[PDB]
From a paper:
A non-turreted virus consisting of a 12-segment dsRNA genome, mud crab reovirus (MCRV), which may belong to a new order of Reovirales, infects the economically important crab Scylla serrata. Like other members of Reovirales, MCRV packages its dsRNA segments and a number of RNA-dependent RNA polymerase (RdRp) inside a double-layered icosahedral capsid. Using cryo-EM, we determined the structure of mud crab reovirus (MCRV), a 12-segmented dsRNA virus that is a putative member of Reovirales in the non-turreted Sedoreoviridae family, to near-atomic resolutions with icosahedral symmetry (3.1 Å) and without imposing icosahedral symmetry (3.4 Å). These structures revealed the organization of the major capsid proteins in two layers: an outer T = 13 layer consisting of VP12 trimers and unique VP11 clamps, and an inner T = 1 layer consisting of VP3 dimers.
Subsequent 3D reconstruction with D5 symmetry imposed resulted in a 3.4 Å resolution map. All copies of the structural proteins in the D5 reconstruction were almost identical to those in the corresponding icosahedral map, with the exception of the well resolved ten RdRps near the ten 5-fold vertices. A hallmark of the MCRV non-icosahedral (C1 and D5) reconstruction is the ten well-resolved RdRp densities located slightly offset (~30 Å) from ten of the twelve icosahedral vertices that are organized with D5 symmetry. The structure of the RdRp revealed a compact, cage-like structure ~75 Å in diameter with an extended protrusion near its innermost surface. The MCRV RdRp can be divided into three domains: an N-terminal domain (residues 1–617), a central polymerase domain (residues 618–1090), and a C-terminal bracelet domain (residues 1091–1422). In addition to the distinctive arrangement, the RdRp of MCRV has two conspicuous structural features: a specific protrusion on the innermost surface of the RdRp, and a long loop that blocks the gap between the thumb and finger subdomains. While the RdRp is located next to the 5-fold vertices, it is offset such that only three of the five VP3AB dimers contact the RdRp. At the N-terminus of VP3A1, residues 59–69 form a loop that facilitates interactions with the RdRp. The extended N-terminus of the VP3A2 interacts with the RdRp, with residues 40–48 forming an anti-parallel β-sheet with the residues 1220–1226 and 1390–1395 of the RdRp. Together, these two unique conformations of N-termini in VP3A essentially bracket opposite sides of the RdRp and likely help anchor the polymerase to the capsid.
Author numbering:
A (entry chain C): 61 to 854
B (entry chain D): 303 to 352
C (entry chain D): 454 to 503
D (entry chain Z): 301 to 1425
Amino acid sequence: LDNVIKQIEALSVIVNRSEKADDAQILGPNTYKQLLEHLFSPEENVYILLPIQAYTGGVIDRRDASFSNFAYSIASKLMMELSAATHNKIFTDYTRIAASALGPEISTEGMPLFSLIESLELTEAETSRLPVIQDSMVIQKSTATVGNAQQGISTINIKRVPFVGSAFQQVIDQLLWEYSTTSLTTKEQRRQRITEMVNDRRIMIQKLTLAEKPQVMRHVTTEINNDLFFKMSPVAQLYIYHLDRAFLDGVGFTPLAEKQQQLQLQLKTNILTANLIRSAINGMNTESNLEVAIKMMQAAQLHRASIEIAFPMNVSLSPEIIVQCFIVWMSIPEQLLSDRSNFIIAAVIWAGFSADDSYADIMRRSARASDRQNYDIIKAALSSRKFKLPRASTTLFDENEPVVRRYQIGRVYAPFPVDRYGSPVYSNCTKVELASDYNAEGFTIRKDDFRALQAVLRIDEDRAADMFTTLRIMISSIPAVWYDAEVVHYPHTAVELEQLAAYGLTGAYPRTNHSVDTIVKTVNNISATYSTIAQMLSTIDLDPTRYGTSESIDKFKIAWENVESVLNMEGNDFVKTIMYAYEDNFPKKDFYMMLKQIASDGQGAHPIAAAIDQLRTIVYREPERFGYIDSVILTHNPDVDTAYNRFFHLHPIVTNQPSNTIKNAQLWNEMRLEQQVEHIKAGPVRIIGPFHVTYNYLSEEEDMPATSHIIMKDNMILNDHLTFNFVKRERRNNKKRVSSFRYKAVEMYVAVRISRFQLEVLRDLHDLVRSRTYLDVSKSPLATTPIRVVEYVR
Amino acid sequence: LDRAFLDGVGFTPLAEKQQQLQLQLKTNILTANLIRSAINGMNTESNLEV
Amino acid sequence: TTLFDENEPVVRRYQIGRVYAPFPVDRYGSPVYSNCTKVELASDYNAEGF
Amino acid sequence: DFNLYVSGGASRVRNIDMSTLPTSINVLDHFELYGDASMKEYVRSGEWYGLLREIEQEGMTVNESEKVFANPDTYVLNVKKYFLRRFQQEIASTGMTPLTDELLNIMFVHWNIIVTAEPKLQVIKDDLLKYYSRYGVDATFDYNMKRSEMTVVTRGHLLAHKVLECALRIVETIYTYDIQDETFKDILIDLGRLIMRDPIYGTTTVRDATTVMKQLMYTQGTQFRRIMFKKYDYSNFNEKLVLKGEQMTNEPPTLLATTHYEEMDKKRIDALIKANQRAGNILSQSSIERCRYTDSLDLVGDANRYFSALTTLEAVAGFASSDLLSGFIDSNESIEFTGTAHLRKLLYHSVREQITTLNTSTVPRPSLPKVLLSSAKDTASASIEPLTFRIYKTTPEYDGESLNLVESTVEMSTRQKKPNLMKAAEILRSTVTTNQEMIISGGTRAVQGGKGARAVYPTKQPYHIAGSLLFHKVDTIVNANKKYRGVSNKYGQGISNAIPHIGVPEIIAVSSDGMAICLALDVSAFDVAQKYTEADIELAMRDGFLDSEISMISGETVLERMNPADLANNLLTNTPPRYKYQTALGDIIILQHDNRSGVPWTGTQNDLVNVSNHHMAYDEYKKRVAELQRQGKISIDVNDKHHIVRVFGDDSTFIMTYDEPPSAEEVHLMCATFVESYQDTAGTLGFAINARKGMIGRYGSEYLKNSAIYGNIKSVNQVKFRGSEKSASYHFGVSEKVSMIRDITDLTITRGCDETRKWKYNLMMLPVDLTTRAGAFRMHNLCSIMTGVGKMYLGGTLNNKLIASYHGSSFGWNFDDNLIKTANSIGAISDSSYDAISTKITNLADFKDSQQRITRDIITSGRLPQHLNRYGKSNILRHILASAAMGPLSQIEKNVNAYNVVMGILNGKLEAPTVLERLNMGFKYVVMSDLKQDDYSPYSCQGLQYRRMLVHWGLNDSRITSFDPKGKLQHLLAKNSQILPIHFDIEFVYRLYLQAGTMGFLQVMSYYQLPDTLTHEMLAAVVALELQLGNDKYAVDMGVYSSQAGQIRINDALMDSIIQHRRGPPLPIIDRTLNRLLLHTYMLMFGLMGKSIDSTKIDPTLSWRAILESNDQRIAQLSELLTAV
């Protein structure tokens, strides 16, 4: 029942906040994690590495008991957990000993070799082999190549240090090393690419010291060039309009009173005599100058969004209409108006100077399809030796401001008829001579009134510096490829005649107080927020077959969810508002299709997409380490396989050939009592569905009788965890025969057993060492303080 | 049968439509744009029968 | 609008038929128009006085 | 630490004695604890204290809130001080005359005059005399004119004064209204004797009975005399109505309350018996028998006066109020939210859409320097915060010649709104407009009828300034005044309201036409009701200004350094401030979420919300009506075509038209359906509608205090100058008294009162009033003085000033006008007493802040400072500092002028002929014929002759063509914006003309960059204004209409036709507006006598002299230009 209103923040504040932090340029040191091993030995020269569960997650598919889904879920969740530990880190730190006048630098990276004496009960003969193992694990150095063709081809130095542990540990470490070091590069290549990208000699980049050249830095997967901005064209007009709206906070118009006073001094008529030109401009105000200035700038940038004037007349004319049309003709350049507007004002002008033609007939005969030719032939008639009315024009300015940016710029028209000198520019000639007066259904204009009108519409000649600084900051901050974008929202290019006339009479120009860096930062933010969604689509959704371009509109709600979620991530607010404001002209479907095309063209999906696929194979290979197994077997009077008795005194492992297997659980659970007894009477019965199994290894000193396999309450229901019990055979007691009493005295008539099991045995202690790779910070140190331009030297 | 099975109807209210119309068409007052005036006088409570 | 003959299989006893869509939208979300789209016209609506 | 909340029992103080049981000290525990029943025992309320104190001895936090509550000591108060304080903020007593003069003057010297006509009035004198004789002494009226304010001081009784007030207003009302029927003045006397005993609480007790009596008042009738008008197009707001004829009809009006007749009869009878039971046993059987007489009347003869007369008796006691705390407690309790979020979304979307369509426009927005000086002009009672470090009154004032003349100086500060334009330096620059639990002072107002206490929430200057800029473009279109089928039509905010025929034409028409019905539902406390939807409507207001605005948010907090869009984020952010007002036994603060009051947009918000829920109610009312139609009730073929909703702030109306008029019971069914639809669809979110509260029904519509039945307007009058509130009429000048003495009574006669008896009673105190005090110098003006202001006793209520003045040469009357001129015009010396800048300077950046483009530099446009320095572009603020402070020393300039007016009659001064009659204006060859002689007029309460005049010429229209120079130049000034300089208003033009004659006015303004034609036109308007009547601070400020003269069509449309066409050149405007005004006055007088003029020649032998004037006048204007002096 209570609400608190939230005050909105300015665009500049959001842009500044988005660049504050959360950037992937600077790395940091890291070290590998150790996984539990619990190794032991039954007798001489044999050592066992018992697999121990390393990740307790994973959850059973209750539908269809699909096997691929379970493994994919486990692998994906474990990967998302692992990738949160190496976010911006590379493995460099490790535990060495020394290198001093003794054998070279040796390593102690796995568990200490000293503890193996207690953990494995070595004898006096094998103890002598431990010092040579410790003294034989030297460190080897090598090199690797990183960087693609788009970036540079750098070389880095890597170590390869031995350690003691399990093979699964080694493969996990190798996978982590592969995943962590994608898209690496050196400073000495980043600098070269940057100076290549910035072709301006006035800007010079900080030179690198000799100790910083081989430093290692992380770069983006794919650079952002003009190609990404070129595919923005279907919606570029809205972005351009809003960018102009957000950075044009004021207008430098001269007040109307001074213009009235200047006109009064020029007119030769008496103060008491009434004249319509003087009395018409008095009904004007400059309060809509900012909007018209923004629209004029937009029309200057894009040559398709020409200004379309909306007039308040249908057939007849009025004294204000004529003078406003003349002001527009003599002040507003023709390159910023549509063909229809040019023809309309030209016809209004020509209706009075013509001997016989009128207004209504000159509009009723012509057709709007081919008005350009009519405008051209009328303009020629006004540039003959009988009539000479100058028409305001403009030219192209290529002035560029020095700033760091990634995209090319181009030429734009200027929103005023000036040519960098106070004198204005006209298409035909700078003279006003006419054969006769102006008359059209009354409203005569005297001969010299036009000459007086020309003398007041001149630019102040003083504000030129301010009149050009804004054009400077606007030319060199809008990508050139957007200049061919169409118009998607008509109201952004429609002004009324009175507003345009008032704008042209005072000679207003756009003005600004911001700098150039803010606008380019905003453009970079736009590009970043598009690239984020592009790679998300390319890594989650991109799929050719299976519901492509022909699917029910019902499915679109599912697809739009991810894009909507990404568009609300505290820093993408610029695009989100544009989307939710102009939905009706650019609906969601075409936006989604454009994003699909952008992602399909070319885009690095993610380092994790291949990582999960590579990890799924490891998940398939070793089930025990991930705490699951399939195809448990139920039987009574089982038998041992006599192939694992060498390692365990007694084990849940059997070798019976199954019969009449059950499809999956919850069918054996509810089948019936004394109906499943017939199944077990005929022989072993196998349950296929995967389970969440945990193993417990115990010595021959105690027991852990969990044994919750089968619960009898008017049925034979399977459990959900199925914990099993092993007993280790050790050198302390290996010639003793266990009576096999506690195993069966705690179980029931029906026994639950396991068909297959995996363990690794070793014959020599030398085989207990594996390898990992590092970064060798001594020769290729991690980088800090990324490349910057020089300014504030002190 | 159609009357007994089509229990309810789904429709956006007129306020939303007027809002979107003004957003899609920016016209200054004192110009007699009869599209706005005519639509501004409608009611939509007769939707089930239609 | 166009005909539409997609149905959910279910056991019945009588015949089934095709019905016109009272919705101007197609199955894939694109609007259906009889002659042409992107309304454009090179004149103004000149009624008697409106 | 404690405060008293009382509702219903004693919310208004009543007549109690300070000596029966004063009970010097009392324990408050005797009553009850409002919040919790369990925590009320006073013993536990003391043993808790004991235990907590013993714990505190060991050492404890002992939270003061919990500790001191348990102390039984705190519940102590003295009843006498409480009652005195309650009385001294509740009842106001300013009036115009002290009552001790009115008491004996109307009851012991002129009583024979009163009794000889109405004998029923002896009972009032009987009651008063017995009341004085029985107790005695306690009756007290010692007035304390300590500084300038009269404050009564109670002794024996608290409401003894109001008792006398009511006793005198009863005889005042009975005498002035010429009731010509029996048992009606009776029932008035019984109602009066009921309000006698309890003067304030009894007013509210009988308010129910009186309002429910006014509700029906005409149902059981036999003839009605329907008034017929031309068809009116409800759609176009600008449409006007013309009268066409009458017809007699027996059909009773089909209003509401026919369904709920018993529910209201029982309610009023219970109210009356409740009043009587505590009263002196006034034979309730007579009351119950007689109250049923009020609805057995008819709209013929002199029965129309009765409805107007009944309301006047309702406000017998004057300007009482109610406790503020109690009202702020209950008004925030009777509000329910329970409803759906869909309705909230509908409200939000409707408001946002409606703001967007209005903000986008081409109307210009005034700059900050202009808007600052517009705020001072507003002088909102909430906005005013005068502050002056020290304005030393070192004025040498002449003193009473009791024995010797004395000259003395005494300092005095403020006494007028001081804009703190000196502190504008800070306000224009650093000043953040955001609210964070700050505290501001709160003021209260009082109303007639004793309905309750109205609270005003003043806002700080930055908020008012910023707000005006944000809504200037919405407010202008809403108050277009001239709008034609525009989307704005819905809003009626812009109306004259001063007269009913022009201001609210639709209601009168809807009341006579039988093919339409009117829905005049009214709501409960609307401002408080929005406290649950403010978060949504304010949010809609905020984002409605984000679109349709080209500027974007940039986040600034300093005024003038912000975009139009920026203001919205900062201003419309909810979080209202806290308000501190003074009450009895303490001062309380509160926090109101809602539309607030002094907010720079309260009317816009109220009309936006009112027009929003109306659409949602109509939407579902249509569904309910369609449901009834499919079943057999309202029947088919009864379908409306056009429905129009008109909103003016809180109040609103609903008009629906039909092709076939539904029968009587159909109207009841549909009205009941609508009122049930609104109460659940548009009342589930706080609003509350009652069918018994508004004149819902057919054949009669009721707008704000103006209602019309069968084409007969039933205005409510209820204006009381004799007992006004927040005034110092007892210390006013003779000029202000004579201006107020003539116009309030004119309104009283216009809205229904006999011209003879009202003016007879007024004339019985003209000597007793208008007694100026001049230091042992007392005057007593007689009836002659009213001629000078422009009133003829033998004539009607018409401003016959000029015609009198021309003939005011032989028959006296040449003295009084000079007397009022010497009482007023010499204040021009006060105007000529300009105060220079001396003691302080400050940032003084203001002079740089306000500037206007110039032609004759700053050392030209008038070589001599005689008309140059006083209106200097550079001196703009120098001038307005003095031109904003006349009153604070004009009140004592009147006091010194009180010496001069006596000295005029002491010496040979005065008695000189005027200057107006020197100029010779007149006509020749006038054609004159009989008036129409028929009486059908929509204003049935007025006299017979005035009705005869109205039918002959018809209703006045357009309220502009008729000159009325008070408002003509104001309309011209309003239409002239965007070319005007910074400082301009009616006051400036009038004072400039008065100071500089007809030369300097044109001289100064012809160099201030304004075109000549319209300046000359409004100069003609202002000289017409100055010749229509004298100065009068009340008359020039705001302004007052001639009423009868504005409701009769004598505008320039037909006045041009009356004047015969001239052959010569077009006459100048300096004299055309004079001779046509003379013709207008002549037309208004002969008609009262019974004849009309249809032709008139200009007497061109006088017209040539008039065309000669400009010949040599334009020459003077241009010749002084020819020399660069």
